Amino acid sequence: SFDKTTFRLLRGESNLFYTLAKWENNKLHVELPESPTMTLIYDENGQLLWAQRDVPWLMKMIQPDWLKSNGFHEIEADVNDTSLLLSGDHSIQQQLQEVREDDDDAEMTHSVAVNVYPATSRMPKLTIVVVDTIPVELKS
């Protein structure tokens, strides 16, 4: 329902990462903004350069063709994968346990903002992907 609002908010986080990043000696240097979101940074060929967290099941859901354009996406995660993603969020596990007990095949929806930054004199082309780790179904 809030697709444009959700994208605009996550794009703000993407832009913050971009301003703070540096490129030196053919390597990306990422500074964290002053987290309920998880950011992934790819180069112009879709190579992952930097990830805020290491989450293999989620990386497989970021479709390579998305990385060419600015846009909003949602990914559907199995509830047990969302649960693991939110392992450190002890307050939300009881709601997830209730979702799982209600339906073994439950899926959680995670918002995704894909943001493209053409190469400049100081930075190569980057695609910054910001994922909300809190699923839409549980943001209440």
From Swiss-Prot:
Reported induction: The phoP/phoQ operon is positively autoregulated by both PhoP and PhoQ in a Mg(2+)-dependent manner, inhibited at high Mg(2+) concentrations. Induced by dsbA disruption and dithiothreitol.
Record-listed a divalent metal cation binding positions: D104, D105
GO molecular-function terms, A-Z: ATP binding; identical protein binding; kinase activity; metal ion binding; phosphoprotein phosphatase activity; phosphorelay sensor kinase activity
GO cellular component, one term: plasma membrane
Impact when changing G12D: Very large decrease in the transcriptional activation of PhoQ-dependent genes
Compartment(s) where it occurs, according to its Swiss-Prot or TrEMBL record: Cell inner membrane
Highest taxon, organism lineage: Bacteria
Coiled coil: none
Chief location bin: membrane
Outcome, altering D43A: No significant effect (with or without MgCl(2) or CaCl(2))
Keyword Cell membrane belongs to the record: yes
Outcome following mutation: D104I: Wild-type effect concerning mgrB transcription
Additional remarks: There is a close linkage between the PhoP/PhoQ and Rcs signaling systems, and both signaling systems respond to certain external divalent cations (zinc and magnesium).
Assembly, per entry: Homodimer; probably dimerizes via the cytoplasmic domain. Probably interacts with MgrB in the periplasm, altering its activity and that of downstream effector PhoP.
Function as written in the Swiss-Prot or TrEMBL entry: Member of the two-component regulatory system PhoP/PhoQ involved in adaptation to low Mg(2+) environments and the control of acid resistance genes. In low periplasmic Mg(2+), PhoQ functions as a membrane-associated protein kinase that undergoes autophosphorylation and subsequently transfers the phosphate to PhoP, resulting in the expression of PhoP-activated genes (PAG) and repression of PhoP-repressed genes (PRG). In high periplasmic Mg(2+), acts as a protein phosphatase that dephosphorylates phospho-PhoP, resulting in the repression of PAG and may lead to expression of some PRG.
Official protein name in the record: Sensor protein PhoQ
Origin species: Escherichia coli (strain K12)
